[PDB]
């Protein structure tokens, strides 16, 4: 047996659970039976990404014929889906590419998590993370602020639930402090959400960019790292349910520097930086600078969401801001919130 504060123990038991990992993939229509997760290799994943590209190639060239059909078959073979008896859908839209990209991303973290769950077990894992998780003093000013930011930036559009801050752990990933690069302006504390089973991979490898094999059009603003100034915008990525009532969302410092403001999506946005250090999807609603506060050197956009005045002259107007940096060194994980979702029914 071994010891770590009970909170850190709870947290690990939550994100290390192999069952939940299985559950998550199944819930994503992934065939764990015909393709056991325990046998999933990093090479297989890279294979899937390439199949998608080929599919993106067809969609790109308007080839919705045999060319496409063969590409999907290849991919569905590479990444087995469980549709029961139903006939698999022929991927032929960007939105769907985007979903399959998120599936491969999850598999990538499952691969990582398992390759890590191999001297008390939890204590052993905590080490393998090379990431410090010190529980936070629920009386600290940090806590009060994290809580205020969390609630004050819960977007109106997301009322199908409520959030109760169970606990907060301060994160300290090896090497981020040093590499962070404090020279850039717009140093913000932003949200980032993800499913439970993803957290082991995020903690050990940190948040990272999409692979070069991946289809570019499966990324709203290119292969970068995404953040939001609205707690709920991110919490939706937890895909927590009434049974999976507990989820985790991360809060980290992002050196935005000069932002290249964009009204609408663009997978190729990274190319348009030309000096600016990040892309900003201009949302129709966001915190007001007048309500900003500073915490340990980073600006906290907590002010209740207000109208920004942005309005696409012809087209869809993004609801909330979208932030993207294309280099890990522009990110430094700080706090990891343990949240309990209270749905309505």
Curated annotation (Swiss-Prot):
GO CC term (a single one): nucleoplasm
GO molecular-function term, one example from the UniProt record: chromatin binding
Where is it localised?
A: Nucleus; Chromosome
The catalytic activity of this protein is classed by the Enzyme Commission as: 2.4.2.30, 2.4.2.-
Q: Which biological processes are named by the entry's GO terms? A: base-excision repair; decidualization; DNA ADP-ribosylation; DNA repair; DNA repair-dependent chromatin remodeling; extrinsic apoptotic signaling pathway; hippocampal neuron apoptotic process; positive regulation of cell growth involved in cardiac muscle cell development
* Functional note: Poly-ADP-ribosyltransferase that mediates poly-ADP-ribosylation of proteins and plays a key role in DNA repair. Mediates glutamate, aspartate or serine ADP-ribosylation of proteins: the ADP-D-ribosyl group of NAD(+) is transferred to the acceptor carboxyl group of target residues and further ADP-ribosyl groups are transferred to the 2'-position of the terminal adenosine moiety, building up a polymer with an average chain length of 20-30 units. Serine ADP-ribosylation of proteins constitutes the primary form of ADP-ribosylation of proteins in response to DNA damage.
What the entry says about domains is: The N-terminal region (NTR) recognizes and binds poly-ADP-ribose chains produced by PARP1, leading to its recruitment to DNA damage sites. The N-terminal disordered region does not act as a key DNA-binding domain. The WGR and PARP catalytic domains function together to recruit PARP2 to sites of DNA breaks. The N-terminal disordered region is only required for activation on specific types of DNA damage.
Name the record gives this protein:
Poly [ADP-ribose] polymerase 2
Q: Which organism is it from?
A: Mus musculus (Mouse)
This chain is encoded by the gene named Parp2
Full protein segment contained here: 207 to 557 of 559
